[PDB]
PDB file of C-alpha atoms and ligand atoms in Angstrom:
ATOM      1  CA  UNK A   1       0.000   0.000   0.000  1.00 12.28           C
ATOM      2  CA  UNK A   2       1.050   3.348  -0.825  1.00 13.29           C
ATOM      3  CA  UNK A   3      -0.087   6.372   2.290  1.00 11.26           C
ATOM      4  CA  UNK A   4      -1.383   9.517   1.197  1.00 11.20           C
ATOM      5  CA  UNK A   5       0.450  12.265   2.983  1.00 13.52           C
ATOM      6  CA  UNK A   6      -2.180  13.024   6.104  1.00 16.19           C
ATOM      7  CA  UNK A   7      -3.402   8.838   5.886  1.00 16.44           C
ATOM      8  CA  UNK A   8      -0.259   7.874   7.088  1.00 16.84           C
ATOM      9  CA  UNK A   9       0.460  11.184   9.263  1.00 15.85           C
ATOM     10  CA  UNK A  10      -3.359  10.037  10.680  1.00 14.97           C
ATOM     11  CA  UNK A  11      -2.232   6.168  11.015  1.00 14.72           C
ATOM     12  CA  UNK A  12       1.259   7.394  12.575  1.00 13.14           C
ATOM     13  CA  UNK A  13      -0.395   8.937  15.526  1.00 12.13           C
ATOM     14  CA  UNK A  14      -2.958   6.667  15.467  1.00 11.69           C
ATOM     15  CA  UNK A  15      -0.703   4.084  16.562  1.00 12.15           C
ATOM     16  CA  UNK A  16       1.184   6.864  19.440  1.00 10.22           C
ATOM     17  CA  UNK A  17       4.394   7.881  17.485  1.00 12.88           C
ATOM     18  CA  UNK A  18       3.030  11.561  17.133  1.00 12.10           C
ATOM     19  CA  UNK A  19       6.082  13.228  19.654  1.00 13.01           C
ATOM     20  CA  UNK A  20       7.459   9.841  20.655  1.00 18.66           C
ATOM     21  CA  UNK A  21      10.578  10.663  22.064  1.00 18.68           C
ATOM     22  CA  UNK A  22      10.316  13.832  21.327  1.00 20.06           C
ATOM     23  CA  UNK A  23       9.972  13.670  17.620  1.00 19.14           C
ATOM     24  CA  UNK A  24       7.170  15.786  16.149  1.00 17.98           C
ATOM     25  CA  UNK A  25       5.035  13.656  14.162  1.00 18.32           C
ATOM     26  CA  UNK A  26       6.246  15.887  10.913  1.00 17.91           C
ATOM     27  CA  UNK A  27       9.542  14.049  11.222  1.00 13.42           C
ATOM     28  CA  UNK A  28       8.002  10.660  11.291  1.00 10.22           C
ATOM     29  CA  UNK A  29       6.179  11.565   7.846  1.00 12.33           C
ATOM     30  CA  UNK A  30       9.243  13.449   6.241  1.00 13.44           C
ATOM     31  CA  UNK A  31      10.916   9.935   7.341  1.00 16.90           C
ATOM     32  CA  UNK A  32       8.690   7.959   5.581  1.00 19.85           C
ATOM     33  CA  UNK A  33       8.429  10.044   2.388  1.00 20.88           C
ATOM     34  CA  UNK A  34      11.992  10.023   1.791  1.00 22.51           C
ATOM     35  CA  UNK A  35      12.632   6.040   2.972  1.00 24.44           C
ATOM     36  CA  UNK A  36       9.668   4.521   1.125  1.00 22.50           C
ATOM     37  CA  UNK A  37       7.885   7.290  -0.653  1.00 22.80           C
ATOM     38  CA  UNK A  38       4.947   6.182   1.275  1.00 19.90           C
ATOM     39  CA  UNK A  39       5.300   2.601   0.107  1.00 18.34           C
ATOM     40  CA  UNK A  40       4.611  -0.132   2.626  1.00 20.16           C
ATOM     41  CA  UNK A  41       6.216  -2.540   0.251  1.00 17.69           C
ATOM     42  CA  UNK A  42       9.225  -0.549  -0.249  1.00 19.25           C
ATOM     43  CA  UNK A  43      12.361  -2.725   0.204  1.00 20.84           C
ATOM     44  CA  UNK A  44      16.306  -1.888  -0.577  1.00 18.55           C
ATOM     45  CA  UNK A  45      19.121  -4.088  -0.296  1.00 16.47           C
ATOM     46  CA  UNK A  46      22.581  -2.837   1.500  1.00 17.82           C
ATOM     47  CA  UNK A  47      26.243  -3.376   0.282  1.00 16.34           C
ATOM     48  CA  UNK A  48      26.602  -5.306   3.810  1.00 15.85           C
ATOM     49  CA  UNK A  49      24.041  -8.270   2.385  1.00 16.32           C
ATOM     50  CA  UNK A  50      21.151  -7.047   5.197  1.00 13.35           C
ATOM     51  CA  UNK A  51      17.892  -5.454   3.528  1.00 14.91           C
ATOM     52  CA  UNK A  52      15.791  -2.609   5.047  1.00 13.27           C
ATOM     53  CA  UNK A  53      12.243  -3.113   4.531  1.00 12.16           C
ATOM     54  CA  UNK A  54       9.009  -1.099   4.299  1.00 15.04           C
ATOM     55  CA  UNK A  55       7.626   2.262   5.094  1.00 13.36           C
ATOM     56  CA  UNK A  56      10.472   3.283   7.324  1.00 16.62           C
ATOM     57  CA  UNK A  57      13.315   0.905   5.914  1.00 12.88           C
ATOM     58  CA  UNK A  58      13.699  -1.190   9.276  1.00  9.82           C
ATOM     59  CA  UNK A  59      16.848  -3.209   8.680  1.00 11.09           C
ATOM     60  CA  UNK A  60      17.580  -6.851   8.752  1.00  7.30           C
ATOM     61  CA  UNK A  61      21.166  -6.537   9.962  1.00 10.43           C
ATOM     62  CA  UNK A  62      19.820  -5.309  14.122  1.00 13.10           C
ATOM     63  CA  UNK A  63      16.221  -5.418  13.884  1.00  9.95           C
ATOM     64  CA  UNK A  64      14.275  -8.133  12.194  1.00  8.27           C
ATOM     65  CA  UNK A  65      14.556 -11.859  11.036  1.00 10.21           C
ATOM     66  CA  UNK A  66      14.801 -12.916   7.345  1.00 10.39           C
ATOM     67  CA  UNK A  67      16.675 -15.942   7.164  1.00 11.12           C
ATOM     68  CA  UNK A  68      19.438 -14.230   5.053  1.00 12.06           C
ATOM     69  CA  UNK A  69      21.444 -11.731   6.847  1.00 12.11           C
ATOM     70  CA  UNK A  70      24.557 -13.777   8.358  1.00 14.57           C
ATOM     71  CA  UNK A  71      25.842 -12.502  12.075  1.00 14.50           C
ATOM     72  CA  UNK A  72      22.086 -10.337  12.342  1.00 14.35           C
ATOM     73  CA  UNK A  73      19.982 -10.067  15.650  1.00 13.28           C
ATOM     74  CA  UNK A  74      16.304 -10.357  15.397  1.00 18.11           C
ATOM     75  CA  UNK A  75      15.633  -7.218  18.652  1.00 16.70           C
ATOM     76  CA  UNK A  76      11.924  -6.303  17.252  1.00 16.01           C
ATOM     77  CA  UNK A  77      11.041 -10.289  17.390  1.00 17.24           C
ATOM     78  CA  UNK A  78       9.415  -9.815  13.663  1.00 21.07           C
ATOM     79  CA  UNK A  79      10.054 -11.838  10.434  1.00 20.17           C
ATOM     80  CA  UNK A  80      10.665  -8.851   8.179  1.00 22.00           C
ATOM     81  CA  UNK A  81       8.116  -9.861   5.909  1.00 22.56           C
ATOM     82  CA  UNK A  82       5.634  -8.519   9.062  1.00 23.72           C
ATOM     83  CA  UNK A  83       7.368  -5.108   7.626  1.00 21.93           C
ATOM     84  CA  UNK A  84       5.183  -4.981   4.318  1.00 18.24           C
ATOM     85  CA  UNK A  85       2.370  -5.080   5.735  1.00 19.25           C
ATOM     86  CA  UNK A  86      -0.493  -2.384   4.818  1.00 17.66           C
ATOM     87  CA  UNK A  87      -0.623  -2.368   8.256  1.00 17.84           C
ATOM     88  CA  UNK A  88       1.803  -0.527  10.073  1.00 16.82           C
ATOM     89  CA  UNK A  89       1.575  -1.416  13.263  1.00 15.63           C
ATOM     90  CA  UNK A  90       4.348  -3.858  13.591  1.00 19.06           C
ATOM     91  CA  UNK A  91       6.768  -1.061  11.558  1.00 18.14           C
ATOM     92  CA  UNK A  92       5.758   1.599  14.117  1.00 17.82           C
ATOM     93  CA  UNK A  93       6.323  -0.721  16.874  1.00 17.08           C
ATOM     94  CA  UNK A  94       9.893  -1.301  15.712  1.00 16.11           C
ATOM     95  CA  UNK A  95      10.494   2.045  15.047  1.00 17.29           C
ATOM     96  CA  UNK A  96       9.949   2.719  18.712  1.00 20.54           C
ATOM     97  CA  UNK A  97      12.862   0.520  19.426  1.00 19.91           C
ATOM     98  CA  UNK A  98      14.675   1.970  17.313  1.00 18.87           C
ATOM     99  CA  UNK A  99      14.060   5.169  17.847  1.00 19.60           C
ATOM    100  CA  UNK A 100      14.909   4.418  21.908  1.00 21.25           C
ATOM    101  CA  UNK A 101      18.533   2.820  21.893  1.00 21.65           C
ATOM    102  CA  UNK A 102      20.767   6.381  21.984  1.00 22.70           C
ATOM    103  CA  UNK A 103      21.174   8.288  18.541  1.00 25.56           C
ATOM    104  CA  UNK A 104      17.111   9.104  18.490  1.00 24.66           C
ATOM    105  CA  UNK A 105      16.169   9.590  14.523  1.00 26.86           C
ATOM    106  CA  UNK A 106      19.949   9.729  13.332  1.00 25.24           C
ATOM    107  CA  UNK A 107      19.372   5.909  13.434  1.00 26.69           C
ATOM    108  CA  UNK A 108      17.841   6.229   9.711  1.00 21.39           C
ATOM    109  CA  UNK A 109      20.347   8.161   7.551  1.00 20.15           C
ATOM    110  CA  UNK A 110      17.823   9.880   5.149  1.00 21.71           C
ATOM    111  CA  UNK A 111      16.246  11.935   8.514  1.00 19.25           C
ATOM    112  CA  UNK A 112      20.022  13.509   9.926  1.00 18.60           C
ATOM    113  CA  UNK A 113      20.764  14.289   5.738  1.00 18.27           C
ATOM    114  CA  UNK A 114      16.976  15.271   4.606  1.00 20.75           C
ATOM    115  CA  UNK A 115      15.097  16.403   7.506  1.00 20.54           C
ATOM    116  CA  UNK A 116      16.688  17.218  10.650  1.00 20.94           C
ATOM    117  CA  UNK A 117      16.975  21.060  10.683  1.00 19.32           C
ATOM    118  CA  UNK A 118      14.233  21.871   8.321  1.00 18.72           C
ATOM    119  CA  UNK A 119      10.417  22.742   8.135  1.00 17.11           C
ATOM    120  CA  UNK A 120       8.993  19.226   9.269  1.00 14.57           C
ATOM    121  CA  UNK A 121       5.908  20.647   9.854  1.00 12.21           C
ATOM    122  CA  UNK A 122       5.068  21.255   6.719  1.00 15.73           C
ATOM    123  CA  UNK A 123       4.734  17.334   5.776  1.00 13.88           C
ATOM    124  CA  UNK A 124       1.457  17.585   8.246  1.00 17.25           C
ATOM    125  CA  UNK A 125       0.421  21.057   7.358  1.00 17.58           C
ATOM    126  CA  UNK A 126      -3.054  21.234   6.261  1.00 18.56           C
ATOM    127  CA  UNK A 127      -4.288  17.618   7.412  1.00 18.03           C
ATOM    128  CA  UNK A 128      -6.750  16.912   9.408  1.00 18.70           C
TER     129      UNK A 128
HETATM  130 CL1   CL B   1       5.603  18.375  13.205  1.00 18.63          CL
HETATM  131 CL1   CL B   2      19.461 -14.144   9.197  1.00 18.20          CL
HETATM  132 CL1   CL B   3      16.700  12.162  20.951  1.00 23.07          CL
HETATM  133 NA1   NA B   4      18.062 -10.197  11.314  1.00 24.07          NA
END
């Protein structure tokens, strides 16, 4: 499934990541736009043989189990498959982990180089 804009902003705080941690939920958005472009399906393999899957590009290497990344942990206790899902439930509940072990949102590399520091507002601006 592909989120519109303010559906997944809506879905996102549905499901309590609105200021979790302190992150606004216009970073959470501006996250997912520039990880997945919205896609739930969205999935992108790394030079280190792990895989980052779905709407926030969870990777295999720390946080999920696929059967295919030598050496990796499993912390979220999810195949990554549970990652594709329309629902996002199980990506927002891994993202919390994430989110908690020390480096905050610098944990996914396209929030510290694409939107930390600017308007992240704006992706929420005007929804409802
Ligand atoms: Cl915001
Ligand atoms: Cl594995
Ligand atoms: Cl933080
Ligand atoms: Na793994």
């Amino acid at each position: 499934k592909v989120f519109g804009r303010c559906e997944l902003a809506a879905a996102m705080k549905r499901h309590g990541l609105d200021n979790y941690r302190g992150y606004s939920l216009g970073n959470w958005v501006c996250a997912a736009k520039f990880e997945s472009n919205f896609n739930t399906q969205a999935t992108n393999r790394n030079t280190d043989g792990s895989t980052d899957y779905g709407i926030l590009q969870i990777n295999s290497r720390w946080w999920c189990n696929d059967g295919r990344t030598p050496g990796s942990r499993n912390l979220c206790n999810i195949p990554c498959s549970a990652l594709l899902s329309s629902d996002i439930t199980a990506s927002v509940n891994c993202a919390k982990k994430i989110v908690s072990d020390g480096n905050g949102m610098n944990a996914w590399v396209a929030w510290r180089n694409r939107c930390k520091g600017t308007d992240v507002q704006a992706w929420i601006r005007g929804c409802r």
